């Protein structure tokens, strides 16, 4: 960290990285957007990143070209059509427009600043991500994937932002795995097996595309947000404590509760306990759901695209605090269970007809993002595995990014909370018994 | 449990024994530890291939040939005995084993009663230094895990200190990284420490040398390390180092929950590399045991009644105390009034290893290690220091009484600066 109020970030270059292919691509494929994708058009790009001891920018960029040739949708652009019925529609044109690639240097930032998230929000770390402020419908003129490699005093950070309409976290991490593999072996891709990309396709039989929707450019606001200062903290849960929380939750639960469910419920209760909310207030836990294996027929984890949804468990603060860990875990589990193919199909068909169910969320929710199932440490670009995975902006109170620990059986969380709540958690003896706050 | 797949003796690659075998004489430091057990440390990895590890070890032993030698015990005419090191190339014990039910998280999050499952990952458990007459001066065990590999090693403190063992590990990892066969490896010649006590004859004549502890990992962020450094340099007249401040804080907090009487004497023992402190100084790359234990002594009353800066200054004064003259006097003393203990220290803070060693530079070719750990023997108050992954973070492997552990977890201020895993 640099001394003073200002941190130096020098942008060494900004360029467009186009795919590379051996073979001749003849046609421009089009990917149609489902109601899931269209509902997220006004959301901001999702931003994540990996920390390394060493990265060679030249080889990284070269390998990125090949990886983009293989994951071609990430190199395309959104196309917006104006229909004759006053509506608009959107699709993805896989035209190889390319990916925005930024090379920057933060000479005074070191590994420990990123490992410990030493500042406040936005602080220095926000600058490490290239898609801050970009909304998904900006993909008509901005790349669907943006990459920023930032040289640090003693390391290198690779941050990326991606357009939700083109991929979910699963597909993005598959892309990162392939990119790393390519960079490790040979940057030209000669020595890395090329595989055909299996796209999610269109699983909404009774919905025609493109879907006509009101122009989002003139659409009124849907959500209300209240700006505030926030603080990020890293939480670590050891194998031993994960298992203790699992045992306790299943001891108080009627249904079988997963380890991750138990830990998430514990963190949810502990945050609500110190949030200062009143008992009658509503609190929610928001959870990403990979629908690939829920759909009928089911798709494989290899399927490319956004096949994910957000499930929401709703309770009152009083309910959550008056009940035990098992009860909150059961709330999460029930919310997860209720995501079915029939209901997804019905809700999409209704959404097309403007028959919707308003999502009710609060400013004090637990907003779980990422997944303990992603192996973030397999992303060795050729100079060693990363030493950490991190999330970037945008920020909001209650965000909890889940990362599989270095040890298979452990968990890391990047939490975004009010400074007062962090202060209260730091002083919570029981919470610090089970969770280690960095 | 744990299954041994193979056991080997690894000799130097370019083994050429000369007309005369080189002899290394042992100083009072080396001899005072003859009764102690082998020191054992290890590195955790995602992947290690054993064949290239073995070949690179053979190559590295060409340069670090003393590690392939043996202790030799002589019976003197005055009924005393003496010891020296014969660099005869006898070889290093190399054990390949498998523990399929142990995973990375178990070793990363080391915690529990000792000795436990982890003790079996180290090859020199129960071996004393004077056993070096028939056992190798360095022993290696690579234990395959469910999802990783541990390389544990034990070494005889008569032939090397932590500094030169870690430099040997660095060289070994470099060789295995870039040329495992040694086909293309040309190594600088080893510089031995030699004899720097001219008022002492060698070989020195000596008499023949022959609790439910728990282990826990502590982590100190760069954030809290700087906080402790500042809080110590505020309460101190003399410049205090970050490590001194952190050690002093851990000392006082352990003393506070030790249940000792205010009038009891407590000590902090610290390894001191004497290479630069001897007059004339020896080269930093000098191979051998050139380290001594410095001791800071206070009353439990004195320590608890003063602040962090005072304990830090005690440690710093102890360190400033470690002069050539002092080392000169200790040696002359010891040979007239020999002292070869078996322990002495279970109510002290026994700091071992050094934040100065770069744990994570030891990439053998399949990636940097994800952790460094210590093995047996176990000793109440042992505090093994490891450089953190970051720039100024610290990791500690602590052996403590269960009752002290429980008191430490409830210590709010302690957990504010120190993360107990």
From Swiss-Prot, chain A:
Gene3D superfamilies named in the record: Chloramphenicol acetyltransferase-like domain
Active site residues per record: 380
UniProt-listed Enzyme Commission number(s): 2.3.1.-
GO molecular function list: acyltransferase activity
Any one GO BP annotation for this protein: response to jasmonic acid
Entry keywords, A to Z: Acyltransferase, Plant defense, Transferase
InterPro entries: CAT-like_dom_sf (IPR023213), Sec_Metabolite_Acyltrans (IPR051283)
Induction / repression: By pathogenic bacteria (e.g. P.syringae) and jasmonic acid (MeJA).
Changes seen on gene knockout: Hypersusceptiblity to both virulent and avirulent strains of the bacterial pathogen P.syringae associated with impaired pathogen-mediated induction of salicylic acid (SA) and reduced pathogenesis-related (PR) genes induction. These phenotypes are reversed by SA treatment. In the cv. No-0 but not the cv. Columbia background, defects in SA accumulation or signaling enhances resistance to necrotrophic pathogens such as the fungi B.cinerea and A.brassicicola, leading to small necrotic spots and minor chlorosis, as well as reduced fungal growth.
Superkingdom as given in the UniProt entry: Eukaryota
Keyword flag Repressor: no
Similarity-based family: Belongs to the plant acyltransferase family.
PANTHER family: FAMILY REGULATORY PROTEIN, PUTATIVE (AFU_ORTHOLOGUE AFUA_3G14730)-RELATED, PROTEIN ENHANCED PSEUDOMONAS SUSCEPTIBILITY 1
Task of the protein: Required for pathogen-induced salicylic acid (SA) accumulation and SA-mediated resistance to virulent and avirulent pathogens (e.g. P.syringae).
Name used for this protein in its record: Protein ENHANCED PSEUDOMONAS SUSCEPTIBILITY 1
Organism: Arabidopsis thaliana
